[PDB]
Design a protein around this ligand. Structure first.
Ligand code: NI
Ligand code: NI
Lengths: 456, 468
């Protein structure tokens, strides 16, 4: 290599005192070609390649250096028809046999189709995609194809050959370089992945990206976003204790002064309403007293939100969520009458009567269980004059009577019913109106239903 | 006349002749051709494949300010950013004058690709919901690739970004330059958009992660975009698994059968899924059994019981970490089913035990000893619970339950009685995944004994590999 820097000053001597190029090809080229033909190095970290793919549009020189530097045994050269005249000198200067593929100067999709094909033929080995020579469109197209296909062919790399008195760079300072894709090159991009996952309800994955953000920049503003996603993850999983824990710790940090400007403080109102809702639900889970109207509302709203998200692609699960919501809501109506349970035969016959007319059956052979079912309970609330439940017409109540009778015969409780998503809708709508009443009997802050905007 | 293609075409012919007469191309092009070419683009900006409105354009600038000036005019944006090497900063006043636009320059090293990435990130945050053109016409090969790479990556988050370049076909072997009025500003397509069948890679990736609904959407979406009906068969396979994981066994069976019916035909004799027809037939047979049992509710059909409980246990495994409350519901329903299968070997129903006073007495004593307290005081319900069922089997000599360590049982009796107190059944229990695991581990053991007593096909636990 020291022969080069010696040879560079001599080329500079001979360029002074008058054909700048023809001295480079004569006294420099197979001197630089020599160095690359025995000790070629790939930056920033070296490696070899089974296969290499080159665009050819300008001149064989820099390409030939890249073919050497990649050291692959299988070489493909994508050339413009113009550039075919350079293949002999390319073959010669590299020593290798080449698979030539002709592409139009701007047939970018031809590049796309070729890379797809070559990756399919070599799906499991390192492949180098070299964009050093060609039109802007060709180099760009090959880079685009590589980074795109890296998602499915992780061993793909995108490479290019990197280069005053003379109109040229110094002949020893060329390196073969790997072009970094955007993920590996931008530290803060994981914040975009996290926000996208957040918006999809992938809260667990959003939290992991936000936590990793902290380790990649040191910026603790991302720790608060991790708590936020963890709160929603735990909440959606019905782990109310963990959600309250994380929500508390988040509200803690947003009160402190260093975080006065954090984008989440722009929605403190809705956040505080939400952490209070988790508090109420968590207390109600421990005390199990339907006198905690807030805890009942938040548990039932959460179950109904989950039922609506599962309705289409998880109907058996949605039936289960909606049954539990409707169950809690009716049980809260029973608490309004202080009876959460203890029937006088004055009622155990009157209820047998109303059930009998509702379903068009004789009172005897209506089996009134010790534990009132959904249908039993709903009818009992009308008999004892519940206002919202008395508002139902007899037709729509007869339409619900099948689904209401299936509360325990559902497949994920004790039976084998596949639900009618129309019956799942019936229960959820009935639960929805009850929930709206209970909302009027609690104070729950601003309370956006869905998660807060992240504000970036 | 006055920036028309007609003016330009004549000037080119005049330029054609003045170089055969030994004029120098560079200064002749800059004086003869160039001002007419610019005027054309100031009048009817030459844009393709389909004309488009950009609020922002972003241009790399390495060497020739001329093509960048055309690109700036063609994109027609209000806000223009120029990412220039330090060398090309001197071109900026000419570029501003040739385009009539007030540029915002940003200096970038000629091989600092990470700077392109950062600058595009900065500019997209500043312009988050408007059409943006990223023009790669001028720069080093690394500059152009980098801007294109940034454009396509960022499209995931900024769908209104487009990558563009000035396309220039050459006509003359005589005049090295391209023909003066044939430059067109072009959109560079995303490889995802441009390759009809790369959706198959997306589906396969989604399929191997268990995202069957989304795998099926990509397979179906491909049938339209390419007419290739081999991908409709893969959609059916993805739909089968998605219904199966959703416990929609009837729908799962419909899809499996429709898939076996296609695979049996001659057209699809070499479809890759025929390489795994034996496991497909086992799996569809399993779905048959579960569908029959769900209707019959007869525990004699061991295959249906096995299939249902295996599915429930698989769903418990997957929810065990992030969905403990759900995992418990799945595990309980599996254990309840497996216990009730045992009791059908003796001949009893859990809902209608038909106890005699001796068995009713014996069971109460049996349970009494386990709870080791208030013996003969806690009372047995009309339909036997989980512990109840366990005892009445363990009492009558159950092989799988008789092989149960009572201290391992000792630490399960709490779990074994929260079957209805679960938050998602009737009560308010948060689950200790340690409780789920015990229930799950117990039901696994029963399930394995039941597997012996069935005619199990291949039935690889996992879904069938795609074969491509
Ligand atoms: Ni939602
Ligand atoms: Ni699995």
């Amino acid at each position: 290599m020291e022969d080069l820097d010696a040879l560079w000053e001599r080329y500079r001597e001979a360029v002074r005192a008058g054909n700048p190029q023809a001295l480079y090809q004569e006294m420099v080229w197979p001197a630089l070609l020599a160095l690359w033909r025995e000790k070629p190095r790939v930056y920033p970290f070296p490696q070899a390649f089974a296969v290499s793919v080159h665009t050819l549009g300008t001149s064989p020189e820099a390409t030939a250096l890249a073919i050497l530097g990649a050291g692959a045994e299988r070489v493909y050269v994508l050339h413009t028809p113009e550039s075919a005249r350079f293949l002999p000198r390319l073959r010669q200067d590299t020593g290798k046999d080449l698979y030539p593929v002709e592409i139009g100067k701007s047939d970018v999709e031809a590049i796309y189709r070729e890379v797809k094909r070559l990756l399919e033929k070599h799906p499991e080995v390192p492949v180098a995609l070299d964009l050093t020579s060609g039109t802007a469109a060709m180099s760009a197209g090959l880079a685009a194809a590589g980074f795109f296909f890296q998602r499915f062919y992780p061993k793909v790399r995108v490479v290019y050959v990197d280069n005053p008195e003379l109109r040229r760079p110094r002949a020893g300072t060329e390196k073969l370089r790997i072009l970094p894709n955007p993920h590996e090159a931008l530290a803060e991009v994981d914040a975009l992945f996290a926000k996208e996952l957040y918006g999809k309800g992938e809260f667990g994955q959003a939290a992991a990206y936000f936590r990793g953000m902290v380790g990649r920049t040191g910026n603790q503003a991302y720790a608060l976003y991790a708590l936020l996603a963890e709160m929603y993850r735990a909440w959606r999983a019905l782990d109310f204790g963990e959600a309250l824990k994380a929500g508390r710790k988040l509200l803690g940090q947003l009160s402190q002064n260093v975080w006065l400007n954090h984008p989440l403080n722009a929605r403190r109102e809705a956040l505080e309403a939400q952490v209070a809702l988790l508090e109420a639900v968590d207390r109600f889970l421990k005390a199990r007293d339907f006198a905690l109207k807030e805890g009942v509302y938040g548990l039932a709203r959460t179950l109904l939100h989950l039922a609506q998200e599962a309705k289409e692609e998880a109907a058996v699960l949605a039936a289960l969520y909606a049954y539990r919501a409707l169950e809690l809501l009716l049980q809260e109506r029973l608490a309004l009458l202080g009876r959460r349970p203890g029937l006088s035969p004055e009622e155990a016959e009157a209820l047998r009567k109303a059930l009998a007319e509702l379903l068009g059956v004789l009172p005897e052979e209506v089996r009134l269980p010790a534990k009132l079912g959904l249908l039993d309970l709903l009818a009992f609330l009308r008999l004892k004059g519940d206002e919202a439940l008395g508002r139902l017409s007899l037709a729509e109540l007869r339409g619900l009577a099948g689904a209401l009778k299936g509360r325990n015969s559902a497949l994920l409780v004790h039976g084998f019913d596949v639900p009618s998503p129309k019956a799942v809708e019936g229960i959820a709508r009935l639960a929805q109106g009850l929930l709206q009443d209970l909302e009027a009997r609690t104070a729950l802050g601003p309370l956006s239903p869905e998660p807060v905007p992240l504000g970036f």
